[PDB]
Design an enzyme around this catalytic site. Sequence first.
Site, PDB file in Angstrom:
ATOM      1  N   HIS A  69     100.317 103.506  48.212  1.00  0.00           N
ATOM      2  CA  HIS A  69      99.512 103.331  47.011  1.00  0.00           C
ATOM      3  C   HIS A  69      99.870 104.334  45.922  1.00  0.00           C
ATOM      4  CE1 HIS A  69      96.778 106.494  48.793  1.00  0.00           C
ATOM      5  NE2 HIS A  69      96.637 106.801  47.516  1.00  0.00           N
ATOM      6  N   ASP A  93      99.960 101.919  54.417  1.00  0.00           N
ATOM      7  CA  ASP A  93      99.980 102.709  53.186  1.00  0.00           C
ATOM      8  C   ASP A  93     100.994 103.849  53.291  1.00  0.00           C
ATOM      9  OD1 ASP A  93      99.284 103.266  50.594  1.00  0.00           O
ATOM     10  OD2 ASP A  93      97.462 104.388  51.106  1.00  0.00           O
ATOM     11  N   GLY A 149      94.341 112.753  44.126  1.00  0.00           N
ATOM     12  CA  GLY A 149      95.650 113.304  43.852  1.00  0.00           C
ATOM     13  C   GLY A 149      96.260 114.072  44.999  1.00  0.00           C
ATOM     14  N   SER A 151      96.561 112.532  48.274  1.00  0.00           N
ATOM     15  CA  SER A 151      97.110 111.644  49.285  1.00  0.00           C
ATOM     16  C   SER A 151      98.598 111.927  49.439  1.00  0.00           C
ATOM     17  CB  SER A 151      96.866 110.183  48.914  1.00  0.00           C
ATOM     18  OG  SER A 151      97.445 109.889  47.657  1.00  0.00           O
TER      19      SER A 151
HETATM   20  C1  LIG Z   1      91.394 111.814  47.510  1.00  0.00           C
HETATM   21  C2  LIG Z   1      91.086 110.569  47.805  1.00  0.00           C
HETATM   22  C3  LIG Z   1      91.932 109.710  48.756  1.00  0.00           C
HETATM   23  C4  LIG Z   1      93.243 110.243  49.353  1.00  0.00           C
HETATM   24  C5  LIG Z   1      93.286 109.191  48.248  1.00  0.00           C
HETATM   25  N1  LIG Z   1      93.380 107.808  48.684  1.00  0.00           N
HETATM   26  C6  LIG Z   1      92.781 106.757  47.867  1.00  0.00           C
HETATM   27  O1  LIG Z   1      92.225 107.003  46.842  1.00  0.00           O
HETATM   28  C7  LIG Z   1      92.869 105.374  48.444  1.00  0.00           C
HETATM   29  C8  LIG Z   1      93.709 104.372  47.679  1.00  0.00           C
HETATM   30  C9  LIG Z   1      92.973 103.125  48.118  1.00  0.00           C
HETATM   31  C10 LIG Z   1      91.551 103.509  47.801  1.00  0.00           C
HETATM   32  N2  LIG Z   1      91.518 104.848  48.405  1.00  0.00           N
HETATM   33  C11 LIG Z   1      90.322 105.585  48.886  1.00  0.00           C
HETATM   34  O2  LIG Z   1      90.454 106.669  49.361  1.00  0.00           O
HETATM   35  C12 LIG Z   1      88.942 104.920  48.796  1.00  0.00           C
HETATM   36  C13 LIG Z   1      88.073 105.518  47.663  1.00  0.00           C
HETATM   37  C14 LIG Z   1      86.688 104.832  47.712  1.00  0.00           C
HETATM   38  C15 LIG Z   1      88.729 105.257  46.275  1.00  0.00           C
HETATM   39  C16 LIG Z   1      87.845 107.042  47.854  1.00  0.00           C
HETATM   40  N3  LIG Z   1      88.326 105.166  50.063  1.00  0.00           N
HETATM   41  C17 LIG Z   1      88.393 104.159  51.124  1.00  0.00           C
HETATM   42  O3  LIG Z   1      89.069 103.183  51.007  1.00  0.00           O
HETATM   43  O4  LIG Z   1      87.592 104.421  52.259  1.00  0.00           O
HETATM   44  C18 LIG Z   1      87.791 103.556  53.356  1.00  0.00           C
HETATM   45  C19 LIG Z   1      87.243 103.651  54.786  1.00  0.00           C
HETATM   46  C20 LIG Z   1      88.753 103.649  54.540  1.00  0.00           C
HETATM   47  C21 LIG Z   1      89.619 102.683  55.377  1.00  0.00           C
HETATM   48  C22 LIG Z   1      90.346 101.786  54.340  1.00  0.00           C
HETATM   49  C23 LIG Z   1      91.192 102.713  53.428  1.00  0.00           C
HETATM   50  C24 LIG Z   1      92.420 101.947  52.867  1.00  0.00           C
HETATM   51  C25 LIG Z   1      93.547 102.956  52.520  1.00  0.00           C
HETATM   52  C26 LIG Z   1      94.484 102.276  51.508  1.00  0.00           C
HETATM   53  N4  LIG Z   1      95.650 101.580  52.018  1.00  0.00           N
HETATM   54  C27 LIG Z   1      96.550 100.914  51.053  1.00  0.00           C
HETATM   55  C28 LIG Z   1      97.801 100.168  51.572  1.00  0.00           C
HETATM   56  C29 LIG Z   1      98.734  99.477  50.557  1.00  0.00           C
HETATM   57  C30 LIG Z   1      98.414  99.534  49.036  1.00  0.00           C
HETATM   58  O5  LIG Z   1      99.258  98.905  48.101  1.00  0.00           O
HETATM   59  C31 LIG Z   1      99.188  99.311  46.739  1.00  0.00           C
HETATM   60  C32 LIG Z   1      97.164 100.276  48.553  1.00  0.00           C
HETATM   61  C33 LIG Z   1      96.251 100.960  49.587  1.00  0.00           C
HETATM   62  N5  LIG Z   1      95.065 101.661  49.065  1.00  0.00           N
HETATM   63  C34 LIG Z   1      94.173 102.314  49.998  1.00  0.00           C
HETATM   64  O6  LIG Z   1      93.016 102.991  49.508  1.00  0.00           O
HETATM   65  C35 LIG Z   1      94.012 109.713  46.993  1.00  0.00           C
HETATM   66  O7  LIG Z   1      93.974 110.855  46.681  1.00  0.00           O
HETATM   67  N6  LIG Z   1      94.809 108.776  46.209  1.00  0.00           N
HETATM   68  S1  LIG Z   1      95.646 109.334  44.818  1.00  0.00           S
HETATM   69  O8  LIG Z   1      96.455 110.528  45.113  1.00  0.00           O
HETATM   70  O9  LIG Z   1      94.719 109.814  43.792  1.00  0.00           O
HETATM   71  C36 LIG Z   1      96.761 108.078  44.141  1.00  0.00           C
HETATM   72  C37 LIG Z   1      97.934 108.714  43.398  1.00  0.00           C
HETATM   73  C38 LIG Z   1      98.154 108.043  44.762  1.00  0.00           C
END
Ligand SMILES: C=C[C@@H]1C[C@]1(NC(=O)[C@@H]1C[C@@H]2CN1C(=O)[C@H](C(C)(C)C)NC(=O)O[C@@H]1C[C@H]1CCCCCc1nc3ccc(OC)cc3nc1O2)C(=O)NS(=O)(=O)C1CC1
Length: 191
Positions: A69, A93, A149, A151
């Site tokens: 992502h 992911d 930011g 991940s």
């Molecule tokens: C600090 C926060 C956190 C670490 C970070 N991750 C996110 O924000 C993810 C991205 C997306 C939504 N995320 C979240 O964390 C959500 C949110 C409510 C937003 C907190 N939480 C969540 O789902 O809870 C769910 C129980 C768990 C189980 C389900 C999770 C699913 C995980 C996931 N898999 C895929 C596979 C393929 C894809 O193709 C495009 C896209 C995906 N997107 C995903 O989640 C982050 O910092 N990102 S970032 O650095 O700012 C950005 C620059 C890169």
Amino acid sequence: KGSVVIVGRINLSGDTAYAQQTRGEEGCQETSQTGRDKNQVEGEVQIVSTATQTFLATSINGVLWTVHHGAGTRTIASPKGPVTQMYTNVDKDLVGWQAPQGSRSLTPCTCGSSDLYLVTRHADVIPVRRRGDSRGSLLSPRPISYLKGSSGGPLLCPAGHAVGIFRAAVSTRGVAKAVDFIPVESLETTM
Ligand SMILES: C=C[C@@H]1C[C@]1(NC(=O)[C@@H]1C[C@@H]2CN1C(=O)[C@H](C(C)(C)C)NC(=O)O[C@@H]1C[C@H]1CCCCCc1nc3ccc(OC)cc3nc1O2)C(=O)NS(=O)(=O)C1CC1
Ligand SMILES: [Zn+2]
């Protein structure tokens, strides 16, 4: 789209978790178009950037991992040109490249300790307790905005070894009390 560009690192350095910016925005532009990057690289945890997103990436046993992502399917710029992804898994992911020139790599954790430590893009090292395959609980709640930011950054065991890659936050009304990560075993299986 452009190549992912390393724009800094998170130093565990000697003692202090601190962030080191090694590139400016402007320079991030030309470098993303060519994929050729001579800028010097060091350490295990890189700050990586696209046109729109900044996040982290971690070298473990010779491969630089980050989140899909954040990176998508992009190449990553290097001294010898743009580097194509060695591993990809949208469902997990997960994306990996060959570790960059100048880097060090983390060792997979083998001790089974539930005492973990998450490194953030802010250079904070935050205690976490393993609470399942891909989940661990925070000792202190924190707003999401704090973790955003980060991940692609590592979860480390008390020995400094890599336990996983930070993937998502488990949030309730914008408060994260747990984290979701890709476990190293999952990397080993992707390989
Ligand atoms: C600090 C926060 C956190 C670490 C970070 N991750 C996110 O924000 C993810 C991205 C997306 C939504 N995320 C979240 O964390 C959500 C949110 C409510 C937003 C907190 N939480 C969540 O789902 O809870 C769910 C129980 C768990 C189980 C389900 C999770 C699913 C995980 C996931 N898999 C895929 C596979 C393929 C894809 O193709 C495009 C896209 C995906 N997107 C995903 O989640 C982050 O910092 N990102 S970032 O650095 O700012 C950005 C620059 C890169
Ligand atoms: Zn360990």
